[PDB]
């Protein structure tokens, strides 16, 4: 009987997960399910925990909902572990998205400057959690959604013995969903060759019933990409690529929404503020756990289907280290995901992905050594930072901004 | 032994035939030739007569011949070199101003300009070879004609000429540059260079063969203008072209006021050069070929010293394909340069130069094929261009700007 | 409606194939099926062609059997092409297996000296067949069983544009069948991680219902392997590995059977002589086409299951070139097989597999250039040849032996 | 500057302190030390007094000190070298005879013997380092103590000593060897060496820096004993240890009659050496350390010449891991040797040396761990051992043969 533990129990997305297991219970015999959160989130936990406990009873599935704060008990022989928390809360994402704004620089949640400090705050906690699993459940799996998944994944590989780790995004299932509606066709008649890193993944090839239709799909993309650029690239870009191929335009959006709706996080907070109110008794942001259940299932069941996840490269992509973390199509087995080969990333886009790995790597190191000097190198080399100078300012400032979460620097 | 030189009328031919006088000791050059296009016929002869002067003032039996008919200068030629500029220096003028409109760097071998400087040159280099194989299939090819980086690269991928080297003054500069600093003879200081042209690093700095790199950096950072902690944490030593990348903002602040005030360097040079021909009638900028004489000498006498040049990677830089071109330290040999092994670039700098490789490569294919889509991909993926849309505009404006010497597009 | 063409139509195994399609017709709508053979085999063709035509009618499957000698018509818009012929007939395998015997050297059919000349005879014909498909069916697939599959595959990749090529063996399905009977368990509860080259493939990992049981399976292997060797190797060896880890013992067998039953080919010939007699009107050697139909099906159907075949490495195995041919697990899709990553081959066994690739490569070249000098290098470096001298003798002798089939050498 | 030498009592110390006299010019060696184990105390002093002679006959202020207490000789030592033999030359006796029983090569650094010569040495080298870090963490380590190939390798993988070089006379031999041939000064001939120890190739041969390799080969093949066409088609130039591999049969014909007749070289040497100490009382085999003086000199004065040595691959040989050891040409530098890049080995020879790498690697791990299973895998996979079964027997016989100085097995 399966025991599952989730950290970030009081999340906005928590019901999407418990629904997912309900729809897929026949093959996923989940016994206990534990929801963990931290003291400054106890309220939101105890709210959706009941809604979970309600969704369950209304479906006749015998899933026991366990709510707790003593994380260490929820790991006591866990079988699978999911992580959907956000360190520093939404209030922290607000800082990440406005401090860059002063400087003309992107203030997104997982790219540029914000992404860096999202990691510095977070991946200590990830390693902190694993240091517990090595005592409470060393055979357990770590399935991870806490962003930046592609950097958090790289931490675990570089700084931990944990070989059992997987990361998820909704960018892949998004792009599929996706080119389906572009061809106006039942989605599972479409399969895409993914390769790249998280929030930096490409659709290398597109098949409709096994026949490549990548060219014809690309022509139909004319969120707007230049025809000649996209046609000439011969691959299909991720939504986060506008941050690198359409930078000024983006930038535009981050500026204007600040005056108006507020920042994305700010906009998020309200929508999230009033969403808990629904949860208090008797639709945007992610699918992150419709793609999480598919994975937890296939692993458990050894289904050996093909899903795009984050795992050890092992040479799937030539230019990325074998010991590093990529986001590619994997055969999904009980021993883990298993990368299908790619060869290398296409020339045109090979360097920019190389540019992001370097950033994740240096960022991951600083988050763990706590070394100011490393963190500064991290921002400056990032492609959404113009100068060492500006870099130093945002760094010195955002350091101070999240002092509470960044002890390793003091 | 018959040398031959393309772009005889260059401002730098002094620096050239001044190199040889200090090395007739080993270079039995009988007939030297200087060529140019009929559009520079005059500026050629203003210096041609200045050649025959100093080979008379130093007593050297070197036959100064001048010609427009290029092929007769490849009549049994043994060495062939290239310092010419396609489009004149008026072409460089457009490439520094058209980007200024858009906020994009208007440099001659970086960003948009670099793409176009290439797009013009490469097909001509290929033509020089096309009949270099005709009249000198045994002869060497030594090149400056920027962008040296993507000129070498293009030559490997689209020709069967194995006899190619590339030179830039960035390392030699950085040598004496760093040499001066400590305060010893250049003879007493050596550096490990790995990278590409205008993308080359002081990986380690030696003083007598003892590595002092941490010291040296700490001096540079605390006597250009580099952030201290950035420079210390990158633990290596940037090219002077790394400001366009690590200091992009400052660098375009500078390109603008210098455009209001004194004009772009193309323009500042256009006069200062049109006045240097003044002195060339009877009695700053580069080392680009004193340092590229040290080579040719070593090549003939097989001296096996250690000079930084541009040659087929052959796996010395792990992340660059072996079939591509890099700027690395090399053993010089009568059979060719032989790169020492670098391993791979440090992590923090690996993505950046991987981009430049990608840029060079795409810009190469566009220059040869003449494809618009490949060209736009070149302009978009370059780390100095903010949008597909900006890139789309600049590309059309500069294509049109140079209709004359892009006859493979039209 | 599918059109399939097979060369080597009059083969002993031909009925196993036509049975295979019969059992799997529901998903494999095979319209026409053509059986091709050559004049000196017309008799054996016209015999089993009727037995095929009989197996079909007795099953109610509407598969038209087409027998021919005009190969070029059988390819006229073929959809799939299989090759099971053997150049030089069984009489040629007799020579390959006895001429080494004089010299103390292995005389097997696809390893050592015999394998070399099996290639030199064969892979011209393979390329000869493809030179036809490029005119008659350029969208057709080439599925290949004609040994040596691992060398024949490498020819097509190196010397042909044909990207659509796959090779089969029964060694994989054999080893599975295999460790099943070793655990005494339903075979499809067992899946093995294959990696290596054809007739040189290893069972890297063994799973029973997704749990690795590789260790416990290996202990049960004690055809006998030393416990400590096999346990210490931590992988599972192919049947052809006794030729390299158990050499003298093998060698033994090839010697003794010569005195007695005759050579394998000789033994084969009788068993095959009397087997055609059964075929004339109203069980050993291979499964090579129970694994062929599984593949032709999955490709056609896009089943995306996992089968171990021979395809372009593309970095699936680090130490083997990306452009070369390996024998690994592949996801099987309509665009082709798709290698799951391996990383590299385990250290212990990495070199011996490297040793075989080199042999296939040099052998493949000589078979096509016809260069004596290359062929000599081929044998001498092979691991079952003791000296350049002996090498030269068997080479000079077997050259003469198969002059008729080896025109490229004269 | 205090040199220190382990295996002072070696037969070759003449060749050592004769090197230095021709290079006191640049080597300020004050106190030199010569050490050995108490079991060679006498043979040490027979030559120790011969040291103090020639540093008196040439007028050199080098303090010849002798000691058994090894550590006092590492008292502030600056250079450390190794020529000792573990087990005496009586141990080499067993390793050349025990294989003879089985038909297997009884060489000292190839096949079974090589494995065992290693299995004895490696753990001792690691011990010398274990306290070299104690008393000379700044000091270099230069090694001959065969097998040089797997001694270097082991040191990289199981120690943090970066300061290591390895020497063998095979290349220097092959130099003058090939130099002699044509008939010019050695100063006028250079070769490109790529491979491993006793597994090193003349990739190209230069005469003044012009490549004459095709000529040179055609001379060697038509004035050892190499097949003409084999040697011409391999287009490179084998080590004299490639007969054990490309001529295995002839090589054991020779080891047998030489065993009947004159005895094994261990024995032939045992006397010829016990009689060379005769002359060492008052007034053939190697260059293994005249050529390894040329190094130490270059290392101190940073001469940056080109000598073939054994160092961390660092990617110079593509197929060898970068973390492993190769025998390649190198630039010699006060910071260390710096391999020129080879690219990869030619195809025909790549598998062979990949095996030797595999052999070296396994033999290393067995020597350190002391695992029986790892040891048998080492003996079986070696390309000179015919069976697991033969290997099983030899391994037990030689383990027992050397119980004394394999204390990590017992």
Tab-separated table of C-alpha atoms in Angstrom, chain B residues 18-349:
chain	number	residue	atom	x	y	z
B	18	UNK	CA	58.331	46.305	-41.044
B	19	UNK	CA	57.813	42.881	-39.560
B	20	UNK	CA	59.706	41.180	-42.374
B	21	UNK	CA	62.768	43.403	-42.146
B	22	UNK	CA	63.242	42.130	-38.610
B	23	UNK	CA	62.964	38.579	-40.003
B	24	UNK	CA	64.671	38.367	-43.403
B	25	UNK	CA	67.116	36.389	-41.232
B	26	UNK	CA	64.986	33.326	-41.864
B	27	UNK	CA	62.485	34.346	-44.551
B	28	UNK	CA	63.969	34.093	-48.067
B	29	UNK	CA	61.215	36.136	-49.695
B	30	UNK	CA	62.272	36.938	-53.212
B	31	UNK	CA	59.263	38.370	-54.937
B	32	UNK	CA	56.625	39.886	-52.656
B	33	UNK	CA	53.349	41.071	-54.208
B	34	UNK	CA	50.690	43.557	-53.011
B	35	UNK	CA	47.200	43.430	-54.513
B	36	UNK	CA	43.918	45.310	-54.285
B	37	UNK	CA	40.780	46.088	-56.277
B	38	UNK	CA	40.807	48.899	-58.860
B	39	UNK	CA	38.720	50.928	-56.395
B	40	UNK	CA	41.785	51.225	-54.190
B	41	UNK	CA	44.355	51.436	-56.968
B	42	UNK	CA	45.600	54.802	-55.806
B	43	UNK	CA	45.856	54.120	-52.068
B	44	UNK	CA	47.780	51.021	-53.098
B	45	UNK	CA	50.477	52.955	-54.902
B	46	UNK	CA	50.794	55.595	-52.180
B	47	UNK	CA	52.248	52.825	-49.997
B	48	UNK	CA	53.741	50.638	-52.727
B	49	UNK	CA	56.405	53.259	-53.296
B	50	UNK	CA	56.869	53.376	-49.522
B	51	UNK	CA	57.651	49.677	-49.586
B	52	UNK	CA	60.432	49.990	-52.121
B	53	UNK	CA	61.811	52.684	-49.826
B	54	UNK	CA	62.486	50.736	-46.661
B	55	UNK	CA	63.697	47.661	-48.520
B	56	UNK	CA	66.186	50.167	-49.880
B	57	UNK	CA	66.886	51.818	-46.528
B	58	UNK	CA	67.668	48.442	-44.941
B	59	UNK	CA	69.224	46.785	-47.969
B	60	UNK	CA	66.862	43.906	-48.689
B	61	UNK	CA	66.551	42.170	-52.109
B	62	UNK	CA	62.740	41.966	-51.947
B	63	UNK	CA	61.002	42.711	-55.237
B	64	UNK	CA	57.993	44.924	-54.482
B	65	UNK	CA	55.434	44.226	-57.200
B	66	UNK	CA	51.975	45.753	-57.427
B	67	UNK	CA	48.950	44.492	-59.346
B	68	UNK	CA	45.145	44.434	-59.561
B	69	UNK	CA	45.111	41.205	-61.589
B	70	UNK	CA	45.081	39.031	-58.467
B	71	UNK	CA	45.822	35.710	-60.133
B	72	UNK	CA	49.242	36.673	-61.497
B	73	UNK	CA	50.146	37.344	-57.870
B	74	UNK	CA	49.257	33.749	-57.132
B	75	UNK	CA	51.604	32.672	-59.885
B	76	UNK	CA	53.484	30.014	-57.942
B	77	UNK	CA	52.841	31.872	-54.703
B	78	UNK	CA	53.994	30.161	-51.506
B	79	UNK	CA	52.284	32.226	-48.861
B	80	UNK	CA	49.022	34.132	-49.158
B	81	UNK	CA	47.693	36.632	-46.636
B	82	UNK	CA	44.561	38.752	-46.178
B	83	UNK	CA	44.002	42.145	-44.557
B	84	UNK	CA	41.533	43.600	-47.061
B	85	UNK	CA	38.117	45.049	-46.177
B	86	UNK	CA	35.103	44.251	-48.298
B	87	UNK	CA	33.101	47.350	-49.084
B	88	UNK	CA	35.832	49.731	-48.089
B	89	UNK	CA	35.715	51.376	-44.701
B	90	UNK	CA	32.531	53.023	-45.899
B	91	UNK	CA	30.871	49.646	-45.519
B	92	UNK	CA	32.053	49.482	-41.893
B	93	UNK	CA	30.400	52.879	-41.530
B	94	UNK	CA	26.912	51.517	-42.162
B	95	UNK	CA	27.423	48.550	-39.842
B	96	UNK	CA	28.178	50.854	-36.914
B	97	UNK	CA	25.292	53.264	-37.485
B	98	UNK	CA	22.315	51.188	-38.617
B	99	UNK	CA	22.347	49.299	-35.324
B	100	UNK	CA	22.513	52.571	-33.387
B	101	UNK	CA	18.932	53.269	-34.486
B	102	UNK	CA	17.681	50.229	-32.633
B	103	UNK	CA	19.821	50.310	-29.498
B	104	UNK	CA	21.866	47.424	-30.819
B	105	UNK	CA	25.659	47.327	-30.800
B	106	UNK	CA	27.256	48.842	-33.880
B	107	UNK	CA	30.636	47.176	-33.705
B	108	UNK	CA	32.479	45.789	-36.713
B	109	UNK	CA	32.833	42.157	-35.615
B	110	UNK	CA	30.259	41.822	-32.872
B	111	UNK	CA	26.478	41.609	-33.061
B	112	UNK	CA	24.703	42.680	-36.274
B	113	UNK	CA	27.787	44.248	-37.804
B	114	UNK	CA	29.838	41.135	-37.223
B	115	UNK	CA	27.189	39.096	-38.996
B	116	UNK	CA	27.284	41.416	-41.941
B	117	UNK	CA	31.009	41.976	-41.997
B	118	UNK	CA	31.137	38.218	-42.336
B	119	UNK	CA	28.262	37.890	-44.831
B	120	UNK	CA	30.350	40.062	-47.162
B	121	UNK	CA	33.819	38.640	-46.623
B	122	UNK	CA	33.367	34.864	-46.508
B	123	UNK	CA	32.174	34.400	-50.064
B	124	UNK	CA	35.219	36.310	-51.267
B	125	UNK	CA	37.714	34.329	-49.186
B	126	UNK	CA	36.172	31.228	-50.718
B	127	UNK	CA	36.811	32.735	-54.131
B	128	UNK	CA	40.440	33.528	-53.401
B	129	UNK	CA	40.834	29.871	-52.404
B	130	UNK	CA	38.846	28.624	-55.381
B	131	UNK	CA	41.792	29.741	-57.476
B	132	UNK	CA	44.368	29.479	-54.774
B	133	UNK	CA	43.936	25.788	-55.415
B	134	UNK	CA	44.386	26.811	-59.064
B	135	UNK	CA	47.803	28.415	-58.797
B	136	UNK	CA	49.069	27.630	-55.293
B	137	UNK	CA	47.560	24.395	-54.045
B	138	UNK	CA	50.714	23.932	-51.984
B	139	UNK	CA	50.639	27.427	-50.522
B	140	UNK	CA	49.572	28.497	-47.055
B	141	UNK	CA	46.775	30.912	-46.165
B	142	UNK	CA	47.197	33.288	-43.229
B	143	UNK	CA	44.277	35.566	-42.391
B	144	UNK	CA	43.352	38.705	-40.454
B	145	UNK	CA	40.469	39.971	-42.591
B	146	UNK	CA	37.911	40.003	-39.820
B	147	UNK	CA	35.823	38.524	-38.289
B	148	UNK	CA	38.744	36.139	-37.890
B	149	UNK	CA	36.655	33.737	-35.834
B	150	UNK	CA	33.951	32.988	-38.376
B	151	UNK	CA	36.315	33.387	-41.307
B	152	UNK	CA	38.439	30.414	-40.191
B	153	UNK	CA	35.339	28.367	-39.325
B	154	UNK	CA	33.758	28.959	-42.700
B	155	UNK	CA	36.953	27.889	-44.462
B	156	UNK	CA	37.082	24.525	-42.738
B	157	UNK	CA	33.400	23.737	-43.298
B	158	UNK	CA	33.118	24.804	-46.946
B	159	UNK	CA	36.572	24.237	-48.432
B	160	UNK	CA	39.174	21.484	-48.661
B	161	UNK	CA	42.000	23.854	-47.792
B	162	UNK	CA	43.723	22.439	-44.726
B	163	UNK	CA	46.387	25.166	-44.815
B	164	UNK	CA	44.779	28.007	-42.816
B	165	UNK	CA	45.628	30.130	-39.758
B	166	UNK	CA	43.969	33.157	-38.163
B	167	UNK	CA	45.401	36.038	-36.135
B	168	UNK	CA	44.148	38.819	-33.873
B	169	UNK	CA	46.022	41.179	-31.577
B	170	UNK	CA	43.751	40.518	-28.622
B	171	UNK	CA	46.025	37.926	-27.032
B	172	UNK	CA	49.369	39.559	-27.763
B	173	UNK	CA	47.816	42.724	-26.435
B	174	UNK	CA	46.624	40.947	-23.324
B	175	UNK	CA	50.107	39.558	-22.967
B	176	UNK	CA	52.139	42.717	-22.791
B	177	UNK	CA	49.042	44.250	-21.295
B	178	UNK	CA	49.254	41.831	-18.393
B	179	UNK	CA	53.017	41.755	-18.680
B	180	UNK	CA	53.294	45.477	-18.080
B	181	UNK	CA	51.087	45.259	-14.989
B	182	UNK	CA	53.361	43.219	-12.766
B	183	UNK	CA	56.389	44.993	-14.209
B	184	UNK	CA	58.541	42.373	-15.899
B	185	UNK	CA	59.693	41.658	-19.424
B	186	UNK	CA	57.146	40.057	-21.725
B	187	UNK	CA	59.717	37.327	-22.159
B	188	UNK	CA	58.922	36.461	-18.545
B	189	UNK	CA	55.145	36.126	-18.811
B	190	UNK	CA	52.959	33.566	-20.505
B	191	UNK	CA	49.212	32.942	-20.603
B	192	UNK	CA	46.965	30.039	-21.601
B	193	UNK	CA	44.499	31.194	-24.266
B	194	UNK	CA	41.288	29.261	-24.973
B	195	UNK	CA	38.244	30.498	-26.837
B	196	UNK	CA	37.345	31.928	-30.201
B	197	UNK	CA	38.428	35.059	-32.002
B	198	UNK	CA	37.462	38.170	-30.033
B	199	UNK	CA	36.314	35.645	-27.517
B	200	UNK	CA	39.535	34.483	-25.958
B	201	UNK	CA	40.492	34.025	-22.352
B	202	UNK	CA	43.452	34.207	-20.120
B	203	UNK	CA	42.803	30.868	-18.519
B	204	UNK	CA	46.005	30.987	-16.500
B	205	UNK	CA	48.802	33.508	-16.289
B	206	UNK	CA	52.403	32.432	-15.825
B	207	UNK	CA	55.342	34.437	-14.539
B	208	UNK	CA	58.419	32.368	-15.488
B	209	UNK	CA	56.205	29.302	-15.621
B	210	UNK	CA	54.862	29.872	-12.159
B	211	UNK	CA	51.116	30.525	-12.196
B	212	UNK	CA	50.232	33.861	-10.664
B	213	UNK	CA	46.723	34.234	-12.107
B	214	UNK	CA	45.004	34.952	-8.777
B	215	UNK	CA	47.478	37.746	-8.120
B	216	UNK	CA	47.279	39.188	-11.651
B	217	UNK	CA	43.503	39.253	-11.532
B	218	UNK	CA	43.495	40.956	-8.162
B	219	UNK	CA	45.664	43.648	-9.752
B	220	UNK	CA	43.484	44.172	-12.822
B	221	UNK	CA	40.444	44.358	-10.584
B	222	UNK	CA	42.247	46.775	-8.260
B	223	UNK	CA	44.926	48.943	-9.931
B	224	UNK	CA	38.864	48.997	-19.044
B	225	UNK	CA	36.788	48.536	-15.915
B	226	UNK	CA	35.690	45.207	-14.486
B	227	UNK	CA	33.697	44.543	-11.367
B	228	UNK	CA	36.074	43.243	-8.698
B	229	UNK	CA	34.177	40.291	-7.291
B	230	UNK	CA	32.889	39.350	-10.714
B	231	UNK	CA	36.375	39.168	-12.149
B	232	UNK	CA	37.713	37.329	-9.095
B	233	UNK	CA	34.944	34.742	-9.147
B	234	UNK	CA	35.224	34.049	-12.842
B	235	UNK	CA	38.822	33.229	-11.915
B	236	UNK	CA	39.975	33.772	-15.507
B	237	UNK	CA	40.886	36.757	-17.671
B	238	UNK	CA	38.438	38.203	-20.222
B	239	UNK	CA	39.161	39.438	-23.693
B	240	UNK	CA	38.645	43.170	-24.278
B	241	UNK	CA	35.625	42.126	-26.364
B	242	UNK	CA	33.880	40.743	-23.344
B	243	UNK	CA	32.565	44.119	-22.423
B	244	UNK	CA	30.116	43.934	-25.291
B	245	UNK	CA	28.784	40.923	-23.420
B	246	UNK	CA	29.546	41.370	-19.730
B	247	UNK	CA	29.108	45.149	-19.939
B	248	UNK	CA	26.653	45.608	-22.810
B	249	UNK	CA	25.007	48.698	-21.372
B	250	UNK	CA	28.080	50.816	-20.769
B	251	UNK	CA	29.299	49.762	-24.178
B	252	UNK	CA	26.349	51.276	-25.979
B	253	UNK	CA	26.243	54.355	-23.824
B	254	UNK	CA	29.714	54.827	-25.290
B	255	UNK	CA	28.813	54.038	-28.885
B	256	UNK	CA	26.162	56.762	-28.794
B	257	UNK	CA	27.920	59.785	-27.374
B	258	UNK	CA	30.875	58.871	-29.468
B	259	UNK	CA	28.444	59.006	-32.371
B	260	UNK	CA	27.096	62.448	-31.512
B	261	UNK	CA	30.482	63.838	-30.645
B	262	UNK	CA	33.343	62.424	-32.642
B	263	UNK	CA	31.539	60.013	-34.960
B	264	UNK	CA	31.732	56.241	-35.068
B	265	UNK	CA	35.205	54.733	-35.141
B	266	UNK	CA	34.607	53.846	-38.763
B	267	UNK	CA	34.377	57.582	-39.234
B	268	UNK	CA	37.043	58.546	-36.717
B	269	UNK	CA	39.272	56.067	-38.525
B	270	UNK	CA	38.142	57.133	-42.019
B	271	UNK	CA	39.837	60.522	-41.548
B	272	UNK	CA	42.772	59.457	-39.382
B	273	UNK	CA	43.433	56.897	-42.115
B	274	UNK	CA	42.883	59.329	-44.990
B	275	UNK	CA	45.495	61.490	-43.279
B	276	UNK	CA	47.975	58.693	-42.615
B	277	UNK	CA	48.391	58.368	-46.371
B	278	UNK	CA	49.511	61.970	-46.181
B	279	UNK	CA	52.745	61.011	-44.487
B	280	UNK	CA	53.242	58.253	-47.029
B	281	UNK	CA	54.733	60.516	-49.694
B	282	UNK	CA	58.363	61.291	-48.740
B	283	UNK	CA	60.803	61.751	-45.825
B	284	UNK	CA	47.503	53.069	-33.477
B	285	UNK	CA	44.951	50.394	-34.287
B	286	UNK	CA	46.604	46.965	-34.172
B	287	UNK	CA	49.541	44.570	-33.927
B	288	UNK	CA	47.491	42.458	-36.310
B	289	UNK	CA	50.517	41.277	-38.247
B	290	UNK	CA	53.745	41.858	-36.267
B	291	UNK	CA	52.407	39.084	-34.109
B	292	UNK	CA	51.411	37.391	-37.368
B	293	UNK	CA	54.957	37.446	-38.590
B	294	UNK	CA	56.166	35.623	-35.547
B	295	UNK	CA	53.954	32.878	-36.894
B	296	UNK	CA	55.014	32.670	-40.545
B	297	UNK	CA	58.629	32.551	-39.371
B	298	UNK	CA	57.964	29.629	-37.012
B	299	UNK	CA	56.054	27.887	-39.750
B	300	UNK	CA	58.996	27.932	-42.137
B	301	UNK	CA	61.864	27.095	-39.791
B	302	UNK	CA	59.791	24.727	-37.639
B	303	UNK	CA	60.641	26.585	-34.477
B	304	UNK	CA	57.929	24.988	-32.333
B	305	UNK	CA	57.317	27.949	-30.059
B	306	UNK	CA	54.002	28.767	-28.396
B	307	UNK	CA	51.737	31.303	-30.153
B	308	UNK	CA	47.918	31.799	-29.769
B	309	UNK	CA	46.132	31.264	-33.099
B	310	UNK	CA	42.914	30.177	-34.834
B	311	UNK	CA	42.883	26.547	-36.077
B	312	UNK	CA	40.629	23.508	-36.393
B	313	UNK	CA	39.611	22.541	-32.856
B	314	UNK	CA	40.519	18.921	-33.166
B	315	UNK	CA	39.064	18.364	-29.723
B	316	UNK	CA	41.294	20.693	-27.756
B	317	UNK	CA	38.236	22.576	-26.560
B	318	UNK	CA	35.847	19.799	-25.575
B	319	UNK	CA	32.643	21.755	-26.116
B	320	UNK	CA	33.575	23.032	-29.570
B	321	UNK	CA	33.197	20.470	-32.316
B	322	UNK	CA	36.528	19.075	-33.438
B	323	UNK	CA	35.765	20.123	-37.021
B	324	UNK	CA	35.347	23.768	-36.054
B	325	UNK	CA	37.729	26.631	-35.383
B	326	UNK	CA	38.960	27.908	-32.028
B	327	UNK	CA	41.400	30.521	-30.760
B	328	UNK	CA	43.917	28.569	-28.703
B	329	UNK	CA	47.640	28.403	-27.891
B	330	UNK	CA	49.515	26.272	-30.406
B	331	UNK	CA	52.846	24.639	-31.207
B	332	UNK	CA	53.958	26.013	-34.568
B	333	UNK	CA	55.275	23.481	-37.048
B	334	UNK	CA	56.321	23.286	-40.674
B	335	UNK	CA	53.284	21.030	-41.190
B	336	UNK	CA	50.987	23.409	-39.322
B	337	UNK	CA	49.919	24.624	-35.901
B	338	UNK	CA	49.208	21.937	-33.323
B	339	UNK	CA	46.839	22.932	-30.512
B	340	UNK	CA	47.778	22.065	-26.950
B	341	UNK	CA	44.823	20.556	-25.130
B	342	UNK	CA	42.680	22.813	-23.018
B	343	UNK	CA	40.180	20.285	-21.760
B	344	UNK	CA	37.039	22.358	-21.734
B	345	UNK	CA	36.250	25.996	-21.009
B	346	UNK	CA	35.436	26.911	-17.453
B	347	UNK	CA	31.757	26.400	-16.733
B	348	UNK	CA	30.857	30.061	-16.307
B	349	UNK	CA	32.176	31.001	-19.703
